[PDB]
Amino acid sequence: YVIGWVFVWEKGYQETDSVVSSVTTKVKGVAVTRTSKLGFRIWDVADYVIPAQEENSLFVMTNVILTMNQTQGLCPEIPDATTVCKSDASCTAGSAGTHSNGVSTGRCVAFNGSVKTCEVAAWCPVEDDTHVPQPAFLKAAERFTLLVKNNIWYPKFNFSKRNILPNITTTYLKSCIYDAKTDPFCPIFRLGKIVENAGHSFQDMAVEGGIMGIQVNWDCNLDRAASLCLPRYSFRRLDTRDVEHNVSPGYNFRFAKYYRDLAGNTQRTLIKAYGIRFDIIVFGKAGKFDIIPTMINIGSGLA
Amino acid sequence: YVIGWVFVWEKGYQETDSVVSSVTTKVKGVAVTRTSKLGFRIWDVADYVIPAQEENSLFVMTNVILTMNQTQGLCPEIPDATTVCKSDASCTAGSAGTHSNGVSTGRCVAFNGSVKTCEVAAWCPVEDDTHVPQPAFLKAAERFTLLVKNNIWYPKFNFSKRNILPNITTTYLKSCIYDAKTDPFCPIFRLGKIVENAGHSFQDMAVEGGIMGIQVNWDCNLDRAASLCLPRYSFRRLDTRDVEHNVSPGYNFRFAKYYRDLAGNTQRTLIKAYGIRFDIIVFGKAGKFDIIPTMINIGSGLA
Amino acid sequence: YVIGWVFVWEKGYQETDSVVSSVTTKVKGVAVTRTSKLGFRIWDVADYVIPAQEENSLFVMTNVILTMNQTQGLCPEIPDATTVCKSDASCTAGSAGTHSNGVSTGRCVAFNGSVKTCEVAAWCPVEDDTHVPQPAFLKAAERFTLLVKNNIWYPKFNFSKRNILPNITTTYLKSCIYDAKTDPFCPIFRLGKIVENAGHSFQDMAVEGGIMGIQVNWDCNLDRAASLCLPRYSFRRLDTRDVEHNVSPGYNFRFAKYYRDLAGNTQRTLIKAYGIRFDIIVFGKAGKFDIIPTMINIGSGLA
Ligand SMILES: Nc1c(C(=O)O)cc(Nc2ccc(Nc3ccccc3)c(C(=O)O)c2)c2c1C(=O)c1ccccc1C2=O
Ligand SMILES: Nc1c(C(=O)O)cc(Nc2ccc(Nc3ccccc3)c(C(=O)O)c2)c2c1C(=O)c1ccccc1C2=O
Ligand SMILES: Nc1c(C(=O)O)cc(Nc2ccc(Nc3ccccc3)c(C(=O)O)c2)c2c1C(=O)c1ccccc1C2=O
Ligand SMILES: *[C@@H]1O[C@H](CO)[C@@H](O[C@@H]2O[C@H](CO)[C@@H](O)[C@H](O)[C@H]2NC(C)=O)[C@H](O)[C@H]1NC(C)=O
Ligand SMILES: *[C@@H]1O[C@H](CO)[C@@H](O[C@@H]2O[C@H](CO)[C@@H](O)[C@H](O)[C@H]2NC(C)=O)[C@H](O)[C@H]1NC(C)=O
């Protein structure tokens, strides 16, 4: 038993290589407030997915903080301890610490509540993120569906395969949603269910944003059949909620847009967009018997 | 013969590792209609490539469907069987299926031709994609040229190399275009020829969009010379045309832009951009003799 | 000694696999000119980082060439030797070479200095890049800081780890900046220091743009402790300055924006943005003892 079995279980036979992959992704679903005889911006795939595509990944804008009607000028910093001031002292004029968004004048200017903060020359008013809004603005996004289409290639063979298996069909695929118990190959996932299979609740993760991984895992013993090489799915949170132990901000990005009247009087407005980012983290290795390399590997065992 | 030859052919000697890579890409070429004394938007690299860069990849906008002059409001759905209606029945008021772009009122509203469809509260009018325009709008894109610049690094060595080989020169590189028979190292490819070397015709693939892979393949026996480690090129289609057997849509994306008068009356306009996406799918393994690890590997053979 | 030691040093024991990774990046810092009682656009993270995110990578806009107030029409080509003309000859009417941005009329039109160039139908005036401005416009970017947050996963284990090590804390992390001699684990790098650790000077590399790699390298003997698996950092230039020996342009991209009056009279303006691109090139392999696969590998040694 021993000698044959150990090589046969271990697979020193089968020649193996790691997988070359390509991906495309779409989100589908709509969100709204009010109805007929009324107006409120209805949300679709052309709004909430920006940027429209990324390599192996996509974003969903779950919650938004709005910075409005800016010009460049003079205003107070936000009340945070590292430059809350009784009077000017460490806030050196003509200097700007790496946390900041503007340059000191040397003045501890008055500000409401806590009675003063250090001044900055900056875009004004400053960005305030002291209270990330709750509930998360795009609360309806839990129900949206992500389509993950993936093609795998093995350079050690003429082989390739598409994650939409060769027996899935139109009238099913227009309404299937993935479930590991009943539909192990439908390429469509429901965003709330991506996060729930990772053990987190989308109700909360949507507030401050985060990063989410669809681990499309490929592993094939290519000896059997092309009909029998198959994908398996798993889901992982990739940020972490270790606050005060710290991690810098929960995942977000801070794009802006900018405008003028005909007379040229500039403004920016800035969106601190909090969201969940979905990374389609494909990985695989696959093996095929192949006698030539096997004879060497098993040859060490044959001695 | 046997014992030495099998190890010598197989390369249990040579120590090997898989490649760390970076890429940059530009497209060059122009497209037009009309001439002097006339006006029609002339197309260049600043228009047709959007988004301007992506990781290991780029897009070319071959064909465009235009959704115009929108507001949020009340309008019919497109005539497709899953909600063509004789009268209201399954189209439940206050509900929206995952195919859709708006919410039911419960009314099977009249619409022209096929006499009715279910209503949605939505962006209106709805997106129509029942007839992807032919010939493809940017027909001239077949002649455009993509420059692929790639640098490879092997962490098991101090080694790196640039795919623009160390003997290519200015006056050649300003006009070379790749051909596997005569110019195996020119970094410039012609888009129509990328697709033709994959066996497809750009004349048709430009209509409904798709995904295309430049497999820049590196494989070196580093023992020989740095002058003799070299890239090899190959081209693969990565989407598939298995319609009715289905694949969801052919590759496209659906960005939009949005506007107001000074009085604030909003619009969007939405581009369903169909195109070819080019993925610069670099992969390599390379090997160098190295006596220390060889002595172990060949040691199993020496027994 | 020999038999045990060679297997024990070489690590045919320990089972090993290559790493699955995710990344997020932010830049922080500000740049300015003039002060109070004066106006000049102040620069922050919402301006200079565009595009707002990319997979494993980010851009910093170090230097900008401006193409202004365009319409489509008739104008001369830039004075470059491959179509500087004494009179019309090779510049065939209705043809456009792959270097160009417009189509020949067959006329060698007059132009100032060198007295003529071939005409193009084009966007006009043409893009001029004959003198990349010096010093680089965003000179202050040397002082900006990039935060690199990286999570690693090993599919051969339940294992994962975050590059912000489990003993880094808030009040340090709000002001640490990386240095291989004193702070080997702070996730924040200073852009000028990224380039200086690669041996180049940011003072010059900022002029014509280029590509820069933060090689976050993971290598763990997982036997020891999760507390003792640790990242190591290194920095590499990935473009090259081999001019005249050539490389096509130094790294840049050429986005544009476009506008109309209410009457619809179109313009574009085009930014040839030169910058440094930062690629967070994570790679790792890690090994853990594991007796089952070891017994096979060492079994060849035991014979
Ligand atoms: N320009 C803008 C502007 C603006 O300038 O008004 C406002 C924006 N939000 C927004 C948020 C709430 C809104 N109302 C509202 C909601 C609840 C109760 C009562 C009233 C309304 C609106 O009433 O329209 C508009 C955005 C952008 C973007 O540009 C933008 C770009 C990309 C993604 C998202 C956005 C975005 O959210
Ligand atoms: N805003 C717009 C607008 C608009 O608002 O008019 C129109 C657009 N197309 C378009 C198409 C055809 C056009 N004429 C035409 C062609 C044949 C025969 C007769 C007449 C004309 C035009 O005559 O100018 C314009 C686009 C955008 C984008 O924003 C845009 C953004 C990114 C990529 C592409 C586009 C785009 O194609
Ligand atoms: N639209 C624009 C426009 C415009 O239309 O005026 C001008 C732009 N530059 C710019 C450069 C210099 C400026 N002054 C100045 C500097 C030194 C001495 C004296 C005067 C001023 C300004 O005075 O404001 C403005 C940009 C954009 C973008 O759209 C843009 C988009 C993304 C990144 C960068 C840019 C950008 O640099
Ligand atoms: C496509 O055909 C295959 C045939 O094997 C179906 O396979 C499923 O395989 C998993 C194990 O990998 C089983 O747990 C399931 O029970 C199988 N399905 C069924 C219906 O028994 C696959 O399901 C087929 N595709 C569809 C859409 O059913
Ligand atoms: C750069 O130098 C090399 C020297 O080997 C040229 O190599 C070509 O190599 C392939 C095989 O890999 C041969 O089929 C070609 O015939 C070789 N070229 C020639 C001209 O014979 C390479 O072509 C050189 N670069 C250029 C631009 O010619």
Ligand SMILES: *[C@@H]1O[C@H](CO)[C@@H](O[C@@H]2O[C@H](CO)[C@@H](O)[C@H](O)[C@H]2NC(C)=O)[C@H](O)[C@H]1NC(C)=O
């Ligand atoms: C977190 O704890 C570790 C404990 O090992 C600190 O480890 C540093 O490890 C390197 C070698 O990898 C040594 O050269 C350093 O001297 C160690 N640091 C010190 C302070 O001695 C690590 O530095 C700790 N984190 C912080 C922020 O200090």
Ligand SMILES: *[C@@H]1O[C@H](CO)[C@@H](O)[C@H](O)[C@H]1NC(C)=O
């Ligand atoms: C900006 O805010 C002011 C009031 O603070 C308002 O008058 C102005 O119209 C706003 N700008 C725009 C473009 O809405």
Ligand SMILES: *[C@@H]1O[C@H](CO)[C@@H](O)[C@H](O)[C@H]1NC(C)=O
């Ligand atoms: C939108 O269409 C209407 C006619 O349906 C037209 O009057 C209006 O000017 C259009 N809007 C714009 C901004 O062109």
Ligand SMILES: *[C@@H]1O[C@H](CO)[C@@H](O)[C@H](O)[C@H]1NC(C)=O
């Ligand atoms: C474009 O330039 C002309 C002068 O050449 C100027 O009159 C016009 O106002 C400029 N356009 C804009 C929108 O500034």
